[PDB]
Scaffold this motif. Structure first.
Motif, PDB file in Angstrom:
ATOM      1  N   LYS A 143      87.297   6.484  50.759  1.00  0.00           N
ATOM      2  CA  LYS A 143      86.191   5.881  50.023  1.00  0.00           C
ATOM      3  C   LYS A 143      85.141   5.393  51.011  1.00  0.00           C
ATOM      4  CE  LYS A 143      83.722   3.865  46.825  1.00  0.00           C
ATOM      5  NZ  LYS A 143      82.954   4.627  45.802  1.00  0.00           N
ATOM      6  N   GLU A 144      85.577   5.113  52.239  1.00  0.00           N
ATOM      7  CA  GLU A 144      84.680   4.668  53.299  1.00  0.00           C
ATOM      8  C   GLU A 144      83.664   5.779  53.525  1.00  0.00           C
ATOM      9  OE1 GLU A 144      85.999   4.954  57.472  1.00  0.00           O
ATOM     10  OE2 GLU A 144      85.383   2.861  57.692  1.00  0.00           O
ATOM     11  N   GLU A 145      84.171   6.989  53.758  1.00  0.00           N
ATOM     12  CA  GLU A 145      83.323   8.155  53.971  1.00  0.00           C
ATOM     13  C   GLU A 145      82.498   8.391  52.706  1.00  0.00           C
ATOM     14  OE1 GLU A 145      83.863  12.614  55.904  1.00  0.00           O
ATOM     15  OE2 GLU A 145      85.321  11.995  54.392  1.00  0.00           O
ATOM     16  N   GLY A 146      83.143   8.224  51.553  1.00  0.00           N
ATOM     17  CA  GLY A 146      82.479   8.408  50.275  1.00  0.00           C
ATOM     18  C   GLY A 146      81.287   7.490  50.061  1.00  0.00           C
ATOM     19  N   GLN A 147      81.284   6.348  50.740  1.00  0.00           N
ATOM     20  CA  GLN A 147      80.187   5.388  50.635  1.00  0.00           C
ATOM     21  C   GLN A 147      79.055   5.785  51.569  1.00  0.00           C
ATOM     22  OE1 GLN A 147      79.962   2.285  48.498  1.00  0.00           O
ATOM     23  NE2 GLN A 147      81.210   3.940  47.634  1.00  0.00           N
ATOM     24  N   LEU A 148      79.393   5.928  52.847  1.00  0.00           N
ATOM     25  CA  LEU A 148      78.441   6.295  53.890  1.00  0.00           C
ATOM     26  C   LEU A 148      77.537   7.453  53.489  1.00  0.00           C
ATOM     27  CD1 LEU A 148      80.902   6.098  56.912  1.00  0.00           C
ATOM     28  CD2 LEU A 148      79.394   4.310  56.022  1.00  0.00           C
ATOM     29  N   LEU A 149      78.083   8.393  52.726  1.00  0.00           N
ATOM     30  CA  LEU A 149      77.324   9.553  52.283  1.00  0.00           C
ATOM     31  C   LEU A 149      76.541   9.290  50.998  1.00  0.00           C
ATOM     32  CD1 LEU A 149      76.757  12.556  51.180  1.00  0.00           C
ATOM     33  CD2 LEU A 149      76.948  12.212  53.649  1.00  0.00           C
ATOM     34  N   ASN A 150      77.236   8.857  49.948  1.00  0.00           N
ATOM     35  CA  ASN A 150      76.596   8.595  48.662  1.00  0.00           C
ATOM     36  C   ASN A 150      76.691   7.139  48.206  1.00  0.00           C
ATOM     37  OD1 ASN A 150      75.911  11.507  47.877  1.00  0.00           O
ATOM     38  ND2 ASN A 150      78.128  11.649  48.201  1.00  0.00           N
ATOM     39  N   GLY A 151      76.163   6.232  49.020  1.00  0.00           N
ATOM     40  CA  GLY A 151      76.201   4.822  48.675  1.00  0.00           C
ATOM     41  C   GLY A 151      75.129   4.439  47.672  1.00  0.00           C
ATOM     42  N   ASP A 152      75.564   3.956  46.512  1.00  0.00           N
ATOM     43  CA  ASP A 152      74.663   3.541  45.437  1.00  0.00           C
ATOM     44  C   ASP A 152      73.618   2.528  45.900  1.00  0.00           C
ATOM     45  OD1 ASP A 152      74.398   3.914  42.397  1.00  0.00           O
ATOM     46  OD2 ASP A 152      76.532   4.335  42.691  1.00  0.00           O
ATOM     47  N   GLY A 153      74.042   1.598  46.752  1.00  0.00           N
ATOM     48  CA  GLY A 153      73.143   0.563  47.234  1.00  0.00           C
ATOM     49  C   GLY A 153      73.005  -0.506  46.166  1.00  0.00           C
ATOM     50  N   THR A 154      73.708  -0.296  45.055  1.00  0.00           N
ATOM     51  CA  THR A 154      73.697  -1.203  43.917  1.00  0.00           C
ATOM     52  C   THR A 154      74.525  -2.455  44.198  1.00  0.00           C
ATOM     53  OG1 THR A 154      73.570   0.741  42.457  1.00  0.00           O
ATOM     54  CG2 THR A 154      74.021  -1.381  41.422  1.00  0.00           C
ATOM     55  N   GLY A 155      73.853  -3.501  44.665  1.00  0.00           N
ATOM     56  CA  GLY A 155      74.516  -4.760  44.960  1.00  0.00           C
ATOM     57  C   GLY A 155      75.588  -4.708  46.032  1.00  0.00           C
ATOM     58  N   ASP A 156      76.817  -4.407  45.615  1.00  0.00           N
ATOM     59  CA  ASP A 156      77.957  -4.342  46.523  1.00  0.00           C
ATOM     60  C   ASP A 156      78.070  -3.037  47.306  1.00  0.00           C
ATOM     61  OD1 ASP A 156      79.153  -6.984  45.777  1.00  0.00           O
ATOM     62  OD2 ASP A 156      79.366  -5.995  43.827  1.00  0.00           O
ATOM     63  N   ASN A 157      77.708  -1.926  46.674  1.00  0.00           N
ATOM     64  CA  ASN A 157      77.777  -0.624  47.330  1.00  0.00           C
ATOM     65  C   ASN A 157      76.827  -0.566  48.523  1.00  0.00           C
ATOM     66  OD1 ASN A 157      79.527   0.898  45.278  1.00  0.00           O
ATOM     67  ND2 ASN A 157      77.833   0.196  43.981  1.00  0.00           N
ATOM     68  N   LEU A 158      77.224   0.180  49.550  1.00  0.00           N
ATOM     69  CA  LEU A 158      76.408   0.339  50.750  1.00  0.00           C
ATOM     70  C   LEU A 158      75.273   1.305  50.457  1.00  0.00           C
ATOM     71  CD1 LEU A 158      79.241   0.795  53.399  1.00  0.00           C
ATOM     72  CD2 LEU A 158      77.697  -1.165  53.218  1.00  0.00           C
ATOM     73  N   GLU A 159      74.181   1.194  51.203  1.00  0.00           N
ATOM     74  CA  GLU A 159      73.063   2.106  51.008  1.00  0.00           C
ATOM     75  C   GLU A 159      73.396   3.367  51.802  1.00  0.00           C
ATOM     76  OE1 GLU A 159      69.003   0.904  52.300  1.00  0.00           O
ATOM     77  OE2 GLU A 159      68.416   1.416  50.250  1.00  0.00           O
ATOM     78  N   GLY A 160      74.027   4.318  51.118  1.00  0.00           N
ATOM     79  CA  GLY A 160      74.434   5.566  51.743  1.00  0.00           C
ATOM     80  C   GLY A 160      73.319   6.407  52.321  1.00  0.00           C
ATOM     81  N   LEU A 161      73.702   7.348  53.176  1.00  0.00           N
ATOM     82  CA  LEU A 161      72.769   8.250  53.838  1.00  0.00           C
ATOM     83  C   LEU A 161      71.818   8.967  52.888  1.00  0.00           C
ATOM     84  CD1 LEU A 161      75.180   9.817  56.479  1.00  0.00           C
ATOM     85  CD2 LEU A 161      73.287   8.254  56.924  1.00  0.00           C
ATOM     86  N   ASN A 162      72.309   9.327  51.706  1.00  0.00           N
ATOM     87  CA  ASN A 162      71.493  10.031  50.722  1.00  0.00           C
ATOM     88  C   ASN A 162      70.479   9.172  49.977  1.00  0.00           C
ATOM     89  OD1 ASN A 162      72.782  12.352  51.508  1.00  0.00           O
ATOM     90  ND2 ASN A 162      74.054  12.533  49.668  1.00  0.00           N
TER      91      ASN A 162
END
Lengths: 243, 256, 280, 280, 280, 280, 280
Positions: D115-134
């Motif tokens: 899920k770590e990798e899953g975030q870094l790539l497609n991070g929602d940036g929605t509050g808790d989610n990381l702002e992913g590369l995309n």
């Protein structure tokens, strides 16, 4: 060694080593807003060829140096023409009569003499924040001026008694034939406009020329190239001698 | 190094010191050598010669400029000089390649050169394809071709030929094509008229004899000059083009 | 309940500072590097360039009169123009942020050289603008185009036109996008003309170095012997000076930073520069 | 008849136990390796970037007012987010099956890092989610698409769009299926662009390393210079600790296993990253 | 006329006996060697694999309750099957032909091992038939087939579908008839894909070894990581025994020869194997 | 006139004798060298081959009836034949020309070897003719022919058909003309398949050596594992005998020369040999 | 005016003499070197060759009459012909130009050898002419021509026709004109099969050296194993004798120069030589 002042002597004499010059002039001044212009003073050449025969030139060493002197003078008279009435077009120098400010006719008083007009012009020199230097006239004109009298008979200029050289109002006078019959010029040449000498007057000869070699004639030439710059066109005034 | 492959380099360069040159060439060799019947008369062969002459012509031009500009501007002095050399050498080829042969004009290559064979042209040939044909016609004299002369315009569009696939023939865009064709050096000269081409065994079929190298002289006292305070520049040269083998040179028209 | 938000004890945590500043895409400077560089000390530069060479050299008969050929050149003048700009910053900021000035300096020098490159290439020539390479440049010969030519063919054509003046071309100037759409050319069968998907091709075309600068407008191209035909004259090198006594700065605690530079562009052989437009 | 059937003597023969548990497929983790790795002991990160550079440098007329240039800045923040999950297990199962303990560990660690990798790539940036590369990445410029481009050309274009910000690309990220169909491209003849049937082509195109990951959505591609564009900051490495006193646990003879980790993704140069969609 | 005719003196000449029985073509066994080998001494086998791994590892907010993940397991069984066949021969033939039994033995083994290989591949799974590779194997994805693909492309596609399990392939099983038409593929120009007529291409495709076997049905292909996807368990090796008293053999003056073997095929990772059909 | 004509002094010059006789094209024997050279001492050969191997081995359920498999055999005969021819010459000629004896011998051997090779390949297999390779050879599979197959594709197919017997091929037999028209094959693009006009291709195809013999009929090809699919048995090596007393040779003053040989061709595996017709 | 023409001082300057003479294009002698150079001392040659070998070797039934074979021979003759020519020049010319003597010699040789080659190739055969290769050579088999063959294909065919005599070819003879149009062959795409405008291809075709000479007629071509199919016999080498007393050469102050030679061409195997025509 003609004992006579030269227009060349009136101006400041300096040396140079260039094709032309990038100097700056001065146009008008509304006393403010002053006007200036970066002008070019081209170094044009002047001289006059004289060809005789080698049969005479080789048979007289004294006559050799003689002609050299006869031409040096003949050159100055032409050089004087390029400086004064210089056209300033093709191979002509930026002349004085061309750059000079016209005479102020509103300075003439009904009842004065021919010389009075000259004095009035000397005043216009001050109206440029400069001191006058000399006067340039035609020999014939200057002659009639020196020989002036009043309605009774007394000499206007002054008697031969206490006479001297060529001066007027304490200024050097250069009676040149280059000056038109009925024209005059006054300015502060000493510190106003000056001439820069690129090459002095030298003389060379050539047996082989246009014909020469086949005619046994020899050609003599006095080449001299210089440049004339005008710093203050306001410091110079040319006017028509009305008569 | 802008060696435009001097047309001269393609020819033998020798020096002379005379008015002209005289060489001897075999004109007509009547070869009758054949099979002979026993105790019968044999074939009589004959040989013809000729004293061909190659005159030494002179090429030059002059200019006259104000001395106040020459002795006053030294680096320009040598500029005009180097330009007249280029200007002269440029017309030099003009003769060597298209000499009229009449009067003073040298007997240029194209004048002497044997005409091209219009029959060698096959249906659907490229422009470079033709030049290849020419190289062969040179072999009709038993001499290996030495060089190819072309108009820069024509030669240009030559190097840019493509196959029905798309790729370039002489070289992929990655690097510029060197002036070579079928192993033979190519000389792009504006002197060569467009649509015209010259091929042959220049290396040893014609020789250039230099009587006087391209020199530049000045005259401080030529006629008027002294008075006008001017100077006359002169760039002269004395040449002589000899043609040993005429059959070893070809000239043609790019019929397209 | 004791979190890290504003309401709670989040005030105790101080974010970690990232030592350094982030500069945007620093464009690679060129063009002036292609031209000849020289130092001067005059307000302008009067020069001359061969306009028309009337060659009359020909075979001369013995005892005959030689041909007279003259070279007519025009007297062009290259004026010394000045490029610069300044920044009015707060003195409070300058003292609080030590290395800030050092940054601004290396930042203005860039902005300067950038609009400098923009001139040397597309100089209007009108008024204060310089006579840019593209202004002086001789138009492209449209007659060189043949049936079925590629954009690559055109440049090749241009390179030849440079030889019309007889001067080897120094390089090819193109807009990065055009250069791109060229490197990706394919033959009528599919194969890649330059490098293939395996690897990207180098910035070289027809043995000549290719210069892709965003300075060059889209659809525009320039070929010529830059390292020979034109020369740049540096009157005053790019320098930066600071003064807080300027105008009413001392009275408002202001600092005026000036970044200036004096140039002069000459064109000795304009016939050796080609400009054109990609017809699409 | 005495057969091995169930309803017979087949009860005496016990099937041989094959030692070892069969784990599914373990995806080769990437992305986290493409980015720079740093460590922090705070809860957030503050870095500064040049926001807007108003460059007005131009040619100046003698005795005239010069152009005033301006510069803007910004305080960008990258918050630290926490990723984790727990598993409740019976004390019986854990004691009766010894190996299970260390198994669950090696599973949650993977499941987490996935899920770590899953975030870094497609991070929602929605509050808790990381702002992913995309979510950060600059969208692909459709204007670059020319007539008749292969899916391979598109990538080549994308790679360039990175250069349009003066930055070298690091690698290419695509969905395994897409990368497949790409490597199997052919020309108008039939030849394989990357490699004839002899052998499969290497994971490299246009000089850049290709990275096929199931983590990348189908039809989506991301190109950029990751090595110098974004950085991952570790506050706390992936740790696994167990406790059997967590609430009911003791009274229900349960066991709670935890696997947590603290991260923070920073995006220095978003202009150096590109995201896009293939044309179906 | 005293010739060698049958009706004449051609009876004294005895035809020279050529020793050794001429055995037909020996199909080179392969399928057996592909799979990992090991042995047991039980009636069946029981291995356990991770069934459903409910991964809910997500980003957790501060002071908030984290996610619960679960892991499911399943017990898979692999039964042991028996393969055999007998030959009812005559005692007359046996005694009058000494080396006969020795031959039949070294003949029934091949005959049995032929069906062994035939089972491991096309195992029905129903009844007593083993669950062969083709039955277990995950069906080929018809979706991967693109317009304008050769039979070589299809296999290349299959190799990828294997990667969807995070496991690399190790072999390609094809019917010699099909493998032939593949090696003899041509492009639009006409050239051979695998190798010009000058030499025959080796049994390799896309970097993976190709295994051509008549045991593989025509128009069917199988690809996967056999060396780590399945394992063969031998309970009893191929043995041969003879009986003089079997049934009425003693009275009929006969002799029965038996040849048996006990196998057990386990399929750990079915997702690492693929079966397909060529539509043409 | 004293010329060297016939009717003159020409009867004095004796034409120079050219030592030696000019023998025509000496054909390179091949067929015989392709097989195994064994020798016998009887008038026939009897070998035994497995005819029908009914393999019914299958999976057997517990406590159930196992499958019955049967085998069949056959005695194949290979008769020895005799090849020979004689020449009746003048006893006088033989004495006047000594070297003639040795010559006739060497010429009779070759003359025999030709019709020998001619038998080994195209033996009618009828009354006295041997059962030649082409008569035995299993007919080519007309199904292996696909759309747009070159003549070269066919032989490629033939090679495979040999493998349908689990036996490697040894060589290829073609009529020189056919082999020629094959090496000169071109692709749809115009290029040469085997070798560019710069060099004539070697006698090899698909890794297998090619054998061009005029003995092979036009439009007929043979492929197989000759090195061990059939073998020649020499009853009597080719020898030359001479008789002065034969018939009325003593009275007519003659001499009879005989050259004979005894061969026996055996065909072990016919499935490893293929004959076909080049349909065109 | 003091010019340098006839009417002036031009007689004073002597033109520079260029050393020696300029010999025309010397054709390269080849044919003579392609054959066996034998030495003789007679008027003619007598070689014997086998004519008709009636080979009737066959399979003979037991106790049956055998096949009778017969052989035929022939005495072929090769006459010695004489080639020569003379040239009588003025005694003056010879003494006044020393370099001439040695020159005329070198020319008469090349002249003779030229007509020598002209005989060896296209020797009429009638009268005193030699039986040249072309008049002996076996005509090309038109049947070998297939639809869509190039001129290069035909030559390849000829090379084979040589083998139809069990003899390997030596070289190819063509008129440079035809040979040229061959090297310039292109494929359906437009590429040169030999050159490709980079370098002229070497004189080699199908592994065999090519010989282009004007000696060969236009459209005509010859191929074979020259270095073994024929032989040249020299009775008298090319010698040059000078006579000053020849008839009235003494009284006319003349001098005759003779250049004679005696040859003899033998054709052993005419079947090993081929000639044809390029219909187009």
């Amino acid at each position: 060694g003609l004992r006579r002042l030269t227009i060349r002597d009136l101006l400041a004499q300096g040396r140079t080593s260039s094709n032309a010059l990038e100097y700056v002039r001065e146009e008008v001044f509304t006393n403010s807003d002053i006007t200036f212009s970066k002008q070019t003073a081209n170094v044009k050449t002047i001289a006059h060829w004289v060809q005789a025969s080698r049969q005479v030139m080789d048979d007289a060493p004294m006559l050799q140096s003689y002609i050299n002197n006869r031409l040096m003078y003949g050159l100055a008279l032409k050089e004087e023409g390029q400086l004064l009435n210089g056209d300033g077009t093709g191979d002509n120098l930026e002349g004085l009569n061309k750059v000079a400010t016209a005479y102020d006719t509103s300075l003439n008083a009904t009842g004065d003499t021919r010389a009075d007009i000259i004095a009035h012009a000397i005043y216009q020199v001050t109206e440029s924040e400069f001191s006058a230097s000399g006067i340039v006239l035609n020999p014939r004109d200057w002659h009639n001026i020196a020989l002036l009298k009043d309605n009774e008979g007394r000499y206007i200029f002054g008697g031969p008694q206490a006479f001297t050289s060529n001066i007027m109002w304490g200024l050097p006078v250069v009676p040149t034939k280059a000056q038109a019959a009925g024209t005059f010029t006054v300015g502060g040449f000493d510190m106003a406009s000056q001439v820069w000498d690129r090459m002095d007057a030298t003389v060379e000869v050539s047996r082989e020329d246009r014909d020469n070699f086949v005619k046994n004639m020899l050609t003599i030439l006095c080449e001299e190239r210089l440049a004339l710059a005008h710093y203050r066109p306001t410091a110079i005034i040319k006017g028509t001698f009305s008569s």
